[PDB]
Design a protein around this ligand. Structure first.
Ligand code: K
Length: 263
């Protein structure tokens, strides 16, 4: 069937000129709302959630892992790395790298998380270990953002990422303390106010991770605590036909508003 919400998302997508993917899980009733839910989209920096979570899982068997220092050298700097560049020729801990990756979208920090996991495939392996058969990380920063239409590298589907984000943040994919740390990090994101958050009542609390890349790719993955009801998990992915297209965070906000109005 096509629901009223799905019809509204299709009308938003038509007006945007791009390709929109949405997955909602309402954790009160476990119901889902999908739009292009099984199509692949480039993750861009939304993949930082999986990498940080994989390091948190490693930390469950190593009490001191998150305090371990990692060297930051000049050649490690990539295109966007406001936190890491301050520690060049010095160190950051894995906790500091996780926080920088998640809350500031620092790409050097992501590369250190990927390296801790043995390369992109270590992130994919963690995804598989927690039941996500769809996610794939194939490259490091910055090339994971090429976002070429039809390219499977560094993609997932909205359905898979919503399910995984639920398991990570609200379920038992991580230990208790690690889940709480991931939630704290997401809630302190600095980059999200124009994306999903912008489409929702301001009283609701959100933790999210944005992404952006070539082809005007504009993404957000969120957990949401509405006032008065069980949490929601919402994924909004958007990508456009032109390599040089501009970001469209407003489309994500519009998708979130349609979802919220449908509840
Ligand atoms: K970034």
């Amino acid at each position: 069937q096509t629901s009223a919400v799905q019809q509204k998302l299709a009308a938003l997508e038509k007006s945007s000129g791009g390709r929109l993917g949405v997955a909602l899980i309402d954790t009160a009733d476990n119901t889902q709302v999908l739009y292009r839910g099984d199509e692949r989209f480039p993750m861009c920096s939304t993949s930082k959630v999986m990498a940080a979570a994989a390091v948190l899982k490693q930390s469950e068997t190593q009490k001191q892992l998150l305090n371990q220092p990692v060297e930051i050298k000049p050649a490690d700097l990539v295109n966007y790395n406001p936190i890491a560049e301050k520690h060049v020729n010095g160190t950051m801990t894995l906790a500091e790298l996780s926080a920088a990756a998640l809350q500031y979208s620092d790409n050097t920090a992501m590369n250190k998380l990927i390296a801790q996991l043995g390369g992109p495939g270590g992130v994919t392996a963690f995804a598989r270990a927690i039941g996500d058969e769809t996610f794939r990380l194939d490259r490091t920063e910055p090339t994971l953002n090429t976002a070429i239409p039809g390219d499977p590298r560094d993609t997932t589907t909205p359905r898979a990422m919503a399910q995984t984000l639920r398991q990570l943040t609200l379920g038992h994919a991580l230990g208790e303390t690690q889940r709480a740390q991931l939630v704290t990090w997401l809630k302190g994101n600095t980059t999200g106010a124009a994306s999903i958050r912008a489409g929702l009542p301001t009283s609701w609390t959100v933790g999210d991770k944005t992404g952006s890349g070539d082809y005007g790719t504009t993404n957000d993955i969120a957990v949401i605590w509405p006032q008065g009801r069980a949490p929601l998990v919402l994924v909004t992915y958007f990508t456009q036909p032109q390599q040089n297209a501009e970001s469209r965070r407003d489309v994500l906000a519009s998708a979130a508003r349609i979802i919220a109005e449908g509840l």
